[PDB]
Amino acid sequence: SRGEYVVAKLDDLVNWARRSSLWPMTFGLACCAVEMMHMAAPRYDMDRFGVVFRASPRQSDVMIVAGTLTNKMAPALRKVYDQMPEPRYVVSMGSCANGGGYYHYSYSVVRGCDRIVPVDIYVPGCPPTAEALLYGILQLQRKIKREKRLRIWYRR
Amino acid sequence: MNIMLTLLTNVTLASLLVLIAFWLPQLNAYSEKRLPFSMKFFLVAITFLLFDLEIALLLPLPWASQTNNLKTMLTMALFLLILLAASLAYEWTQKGLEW
Amino acid sequence: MTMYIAFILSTIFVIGFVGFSSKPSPIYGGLGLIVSGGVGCGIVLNFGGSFLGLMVFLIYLGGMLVVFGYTTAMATGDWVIYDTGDSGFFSEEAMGIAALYSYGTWLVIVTGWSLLIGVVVIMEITRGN
Amino acid sequence: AGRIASFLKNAWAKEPVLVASFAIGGLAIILPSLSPYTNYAIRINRATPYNYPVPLRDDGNMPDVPSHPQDPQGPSLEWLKNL
Amino acid sequence: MFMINILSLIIPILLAVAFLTLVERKVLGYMQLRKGPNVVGPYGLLQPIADALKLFTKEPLRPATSSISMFIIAPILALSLALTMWVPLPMPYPLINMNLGVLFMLAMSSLAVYSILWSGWASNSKYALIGALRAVAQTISYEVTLAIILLSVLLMNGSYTLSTLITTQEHIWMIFTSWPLAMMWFISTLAETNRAPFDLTAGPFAMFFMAEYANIIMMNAFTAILFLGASHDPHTPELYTINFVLKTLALTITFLWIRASYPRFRYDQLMHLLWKSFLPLTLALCMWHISLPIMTASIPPQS
Amino acid sequence: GVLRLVMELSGEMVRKCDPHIGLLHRGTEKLIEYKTYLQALPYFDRLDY
Amino acid sequence: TYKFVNMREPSMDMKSVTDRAAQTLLWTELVRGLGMTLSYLFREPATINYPFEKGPLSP
Amino acid sequence: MWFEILPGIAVMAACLFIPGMATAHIHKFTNGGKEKRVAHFSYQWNLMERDRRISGVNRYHVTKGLENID
Amino acid sequence: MPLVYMNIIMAFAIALAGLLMYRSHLMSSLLCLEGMMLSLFIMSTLIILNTHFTLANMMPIILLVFAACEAALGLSLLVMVSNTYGTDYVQNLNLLQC
Numbered sequence A: 001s002r003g004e005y006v007v008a009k010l011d012d013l014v015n016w017a018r019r020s021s022l023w024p025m026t027f028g029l030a031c032c033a034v035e036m037m038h039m040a041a042p043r044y045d046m047d048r049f050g051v052v053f054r055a056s057p058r059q060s061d062v063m064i065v066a067g068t069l070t071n072k073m074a075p076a077l078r079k080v081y082d083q084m085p086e087p088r089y090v091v092s093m094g095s096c097a098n099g100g101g102y103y104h105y106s107y108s109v110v111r112g113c114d115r116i117v118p119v120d121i122y123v124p125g126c127p128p129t130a131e132a133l134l135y136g137i138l139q140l141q142r143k144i145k146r147e148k149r150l151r152i153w154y155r156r
Numbered sequence B: 001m002n003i004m005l006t007l008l009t010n011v012t013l014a015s016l017l018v019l020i021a022f023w024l025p026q027l028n029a030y031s032e033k034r035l036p037f038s039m040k041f042f043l044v045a046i047t048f049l050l051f052d053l054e055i056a057l058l059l060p061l062p063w064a065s066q067t068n069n070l071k072t073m074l075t076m077a078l079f080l081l082i083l084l085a086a087s088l089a090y091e092w093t094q095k096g097l098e099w
Numbered sequence C: 001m002t003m004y005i006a007f008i009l010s011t012i013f014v015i016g017f018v019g020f021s022s023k024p025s026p027i028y029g030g031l032g033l034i035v036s037g038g039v040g041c042g043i044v045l046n047f048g049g050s051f052l053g054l055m056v057f058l059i060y061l062g063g064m065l066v067v068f069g070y071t072t073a074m075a076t077g078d079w080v081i082y083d084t085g086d087s088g089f090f091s092e093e094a095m096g097i098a099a100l101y102s103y104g105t106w107l108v109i110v111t112g113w114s115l116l117i118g119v120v121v122i123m124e125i126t127r128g129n
Numbered sequence D: 001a002g003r004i005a006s007f008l009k010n011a012w013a014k015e016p017v018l019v020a021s022f023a024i025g026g027l028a029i030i031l032p033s034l035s036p037y038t039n040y041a042i043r044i045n046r047a048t049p050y051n052y053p054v055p056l057r058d059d060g061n062m063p064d065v066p067s068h069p070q071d072p073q074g075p076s077l078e079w080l081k082n083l
Numbered sequence E: 001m002f003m004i005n006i007l008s009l010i011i012p013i014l015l016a017v018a019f020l021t022l023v024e025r026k027v028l029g030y031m032q033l034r035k036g037p038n039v040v041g042p043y044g045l046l047q048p049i050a051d052a053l054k055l056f057t058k059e060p061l062r063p064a065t066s067s068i069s070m071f072i073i074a075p076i077l078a079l080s081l082a083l084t085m086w087v088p089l090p091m092p093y094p095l096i097n098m099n100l101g102v103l104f105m106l107a108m109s110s111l112a113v114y115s116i117l118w119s120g121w122a123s124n125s126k127y128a129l130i131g132a133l134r135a136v137a138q139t140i141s142y143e144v145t146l147a148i149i150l151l152s153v154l155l156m157n158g159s160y161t162l163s164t165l166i167t168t169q170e171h172i173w174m175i176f177t178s179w180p181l182a183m184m185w186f187i188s189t190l191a192e193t194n195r196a197p198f199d200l201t202a203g204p205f206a207m208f209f210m211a212e213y214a215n216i217i218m219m220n221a222f223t224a225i226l227f228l229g230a231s232h233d234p235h236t237p238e239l240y241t242i243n244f245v246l247k248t249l250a251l252t253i254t255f256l257w258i259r260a261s262y263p264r265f266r267y268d269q270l271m272h273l274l275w276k277s278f279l280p281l282t283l284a285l286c287m288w289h290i291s292l293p294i295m296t297a298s299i300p301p302q303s
Numbered sequence F: 001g002v003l004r005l006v007m008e009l010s011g012e013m014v015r016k017c018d019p020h021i022g023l024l025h026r027g028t029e030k031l032i033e034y035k036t037y038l039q040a041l042p043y044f045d046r047l048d049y
Numbered sequence G: 001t002y003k004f005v006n007m008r009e010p011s012m013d014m015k016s017v018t019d020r021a022a023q024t025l026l027w028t029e030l031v032r033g034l035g036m037t038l039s040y041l042f043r044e045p046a047t048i049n050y051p052f053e054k055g056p057l058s059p
Numbered sequence H: 001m002w003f004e005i006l007p008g009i010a011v012m013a014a015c016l017f018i019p020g021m022a023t024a025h026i027h028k029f030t031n032g033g034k035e036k037r038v039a040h041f042s043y044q045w046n047l048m049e050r051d052r053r054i055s056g057v058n059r060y061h062v063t064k065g066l067e068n069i070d
Numbered sequence I: 001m002p003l004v005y006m007n008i009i010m011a012f013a014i015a016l017a018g019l020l021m022y023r024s025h026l027m028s029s030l031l032c033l034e035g036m037m038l039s040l041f042i043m044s045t046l047i048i049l050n051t052h053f054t055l056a057n058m059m060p061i062i063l064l065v066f067a068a069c070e071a072a073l074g075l076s077l078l079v080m081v082s083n084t085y086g087t088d089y090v091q092n093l094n095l096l097q098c
């Protein structure tokens, strides 16, 4: 019927708008930050996808954890995450953020940033190439394109 | 009437757009979870106020130039500008423009 | 007749004065004074005082109440009395105001002296020690 | 003589904005008293009719008052035209 | 049909400030050996629409303790003033033909600081209040020299009517009569709109951004009319409109160029810039421009 | 990088500046003691990256 | 062997002082920087068209 | 290349075309094919008022020539 | 005398009474003073424009300027008082008494 057709099209429009302008704030904790700046360098030009460089936390759509999260730093990262407006997404970059990495068996390192915040995309590597991080960002865009909020509301 | 209608339209449009911005994302359910008082800022504000008063005195100059008393107008106009300069120089030399 | 628009503006003027004269939360009092100043500027403009109304609106609002707000934030029957003739090919308010530099030499001298003295006085008062 | 020239040269360095400001203000004060066109400006201002020229009642004793605008009597603006 | 004229003034300005974001991103990218947005839309052209929709569908973070009244008032005042400042301008014929149009624009720009003051006050933060105080101080400081430069320039025009500026520049631009004043005016308009190198500071955020970009475009259009006088033929005003629009676009792109070319000042450094370099020259050149028409018997007509 | 910086200001001027570090303390020197020399080589890539 | 980076002494003749004053009052070096940015806009960007183009790798 | 900035600029230019042009045409439409009359200084307003009174249709822009002199 | 003058005079009297009340907050005292000045400016402008008294068009501007200077002075005083007490409450100024 038209009732579900209208919400389907409106959901498609909202998803397109949300994913075609992703504004990230980056936690440049360690040397994965160098590769994310290489993703904003001229060769890859993340801005050309609508993904602005260094958005503020209060107008950020996605958080990129790029580096090792230590026990001393975990509360600050959770505090920053809470501040972000919803809908918010988290991309985990590199071994250190994914699962602790080369400091997994350490007394001062959080064994994966997903103990602290939920994670949408895990980008592997030490460090991932800027091209691999771009692949992860585009995968997050496809994941956003897959979501369907208005249908769930209409069918509930 | 034209100017009043123009301002009314501008204000109405701004209010409508701000309110729809503030209410479109409020309809969907979500989680829904000192002393210092720098004196320099006050002094720069006061300096602006005084220079603004002297600019207010300066404002009628475009009409002042058709008077048949050109010499007196030039003297007085120049005197005001000179007067304005003295305030700037006195404030400068008394360490009034520092941080 | 627009139901005594001058009377309506004067009534809004009085209401705004009643509002900020209760002196609630000096930022709110300043806001009420800003609204009253806008209404009074409207009164003067509607009367025909274009330059003087714009002087209200520029000097008073944009400088003086702005400095008041700065300092505060740092802390914790009509239409009948009118004329009949015209003005010519000029505006009489502008000619009278422009006569300040040819007719009002004495006023210019005393006003400039007072303003310079005010600058000096503010310096001396705020010096402190 | 030498002191003033040395001071002006030392001010033209490290303070050129103030030297320019004072030169421009001084010229603005001085030149109008020496220009020969300021009297022309005063005359141009006097020659602009904002009000109606109220005619005079003739009494047979006004040879220099014109009886018609085209008559040669009265002020002329050839000097304005040639400017 | 006055409402249609008001709408045909308001709506195209908002579209222009929406696509100015695209132009800025594209220009900065190409000055940085890269591109701007070129994926969303055929040439990035749908990027502003996606930005607007995303911003308008995001959760608004009300401070939960601040003055909701001023929190809602500040963007209203900002955007209302931004849209009001376009009415006086003659392109070639003005929507409202004001006798003292220039003074009206000055008064609007003077009001534009209440939005900064109220947004800083209603942030319920000491650090944001410090930043708001810095912004207000910079704005008032530079609007001083804007006013003085503006009256000095208008002394060659004969009145405050913006249409007469077209008549004054019938033969030659005003840039040739006074380029130093135009230079200081350009820097003061950079500092007035909080643009680099003077950039020291969901929905309502976009409202504030729209107001700032509309003020940028209007300030550049005002500069074009004031100093770069197009020739207007009364039987074909579209030539004047195209010329004026081209000059305004050039000045806005120059703002982007300047943002892409320089570092930013410190607070005390831009304060010293104004109070110790622009104000002395502005006073001196105001004296000079008062004396000049009388010395040379070139006083403009209107009184 | 990541830095916490606690400072005391008198108006514009900086009076005191105390940096707080350790937000990237991974314990590399203790981890090296459990590796061979070859295994401990890659830590030095990650030191000054 | 060592080099000096900032051990130059400005000339104090009238012409050099006038040149520095012209630089101060007319913003010559600012215009020079604007000129480099302008020139640099008029060349090819370095951006590749990912994912249709890929960065170079090695065996 | 750089000319790919031209589309957006063009769009922006078109938007800035709309206000001024619109005003002009509206001033032609409400003023009988002539520029809207300017009235400063109140002698101009008196001229407009006299025109409006002598038009016969309560419209200042309906101009009466010698054909109305009889 | 029409009702517009009556309303402006009433506004002046209301502002004067508000100044004389002194609930607290000397800043409110300065605000009441400047509201009085605004009413004075409006009514003087109305009288001068209504009677077509051209040379007196000078007077309102002058008044404004002088009064604004007073505000500056008053503000300075307020600021200094706060620096002694931390706030601008009226009841802090009781060191000197009759």
Ligand SMILES: CCCCCCCCCCCCCCCCC[C@@H](O)O[C@H](CO[C@H](O)CCCCCCCCCCCCCCC)COP(=O)(O)OCC[N+](C)(C)C
Pocket (backbone or CB within 6 Å): A009, A010, A012, A013, A016, A020, E039, E041, E046, E049, E053
């Ligand atoms: C006048 C009143 C306005 C009110 C508010 C309305 C907002 C403005 C309306 C205009 C919206 C513009 C829509 C643009 C969408 C087209 C984008 C298109 O190119 O996307 C493609 C098409 O994808 C989707 O099919 C697009 C779905 C968008 C919505 C479809 C219809 C929605 C119309 C409903 C509007 C009614 C609104 C009701 C309430 C206002 C997929 O590309 P994408 O995946 O990205 O990129 C991958 C990268 N590659 C291609 C380079 C490899």
Ligand SMILES: CCCCCCCCCCCCCCCCC[C@@H](O)O[C@H](CO[C@H](O)CCCCCCCCCCCCCCC)COP(=O)(O)OCC[N+](C)(C)C
Pocket (backbone or CB within 6 Å): B069, B071, B072, B075, B079, C102, C103, C105, C106, C109, C113
């Ligand atoms: C006389 C004894 C003086 C010694 C005592 C000193 C005490 C203080 C001095 C201040 C008094 C200043 C006197 C000036 C009175 C102004 C009026 C007079 O001068 O005539 C004017 C002449 O104007 C003169 O140009 C005034 C020049 C004075 C201003 C220049 C310097 C003023 C400095 C005074 C002190 C200010 C602060 C201190 C600065 C160092 C009028 O010009 P005119 O056009 O014919 O008539 C206009 C009427 N119309 C339109 C019908 C034709």
Ligand SMILES: CCCCCCCC/C=C\CCCCCCCC(=O)O[C@H](COC(=O)CCCCCCC/C=C/CCCCCCCC)COP(=O)(O)OCCN
Pocket (backbone or CB within 6 Å): B085, B088, B089, B092, B093, D008, D011, D015, D018, D019, D021, D022, D023, D024, D025, D026, E276, E280, E281, E283, E284
């Ligand atoms: C006599 C004409 C009057 C009209 C012209 C004036 C119009 C506007 C100009 C005056 C503005 C006010 C200036 C205030 C003066 C204060 C100067 C000052 O305090 O600066 C000193 C130093 O400045 C000085 O040297 C004092 C003035 C020096 C002389 C300047 C020029 C004097 C005359 C030069 C030209 C004279 C005429 C031109 C000659 C050529 C032929 C035309 C310290 O500088 P800082 O930045 O604080 O510290 C630096 C270290 N951090």
Ligand SMILES: CCCCCCCC/C=C\CCCCCCCC(=O)O[C@H](COC(=O)CCCCCCC/C=C/CCCCCCCC)COP(=O)(O)OCCN
Pocket (backbone or CB within 6 Å): D014, D015, D016, D017, D020, D024, E180, E181, E182, E183, E184, E186, E187, E197, E223, E227, E258, E262, E273, E277, E278, E281, E288, G024, G025, G026, G027, G030, G031, G034
């Ligand atoms: C014979 C009678 C003639 C009448 C007199 C005329 C004589 C004129 C001669 C001098 C006039 C020059 C004045 C023009 C402006 C001068 C202001 C100035 O020089 O200020 C600079 C500062 O100016 C700046 O640096 C501001 C730059 C900010 C960045 C913006 C970049 C803009 C440059 C790109 C071109 C801009 C185009 C402007 C014109 C646009 C036209 C619409 C000085 O500061 P500092 O060098 O730091 O040192 C002072 C302490 N000793």
Ligand code: SF4
Pocket (backbone or CB within 6 Å): A030, A031, A032, A066, A067, A068, A093, A094, A095, A096, A097, A101, A102, A125, A126, A127, A128, F046, F049
């Ligand atoms: S994940 Fe790998 S590349 Fe990134 S900071 Fe940790 S060790 Fe370095």
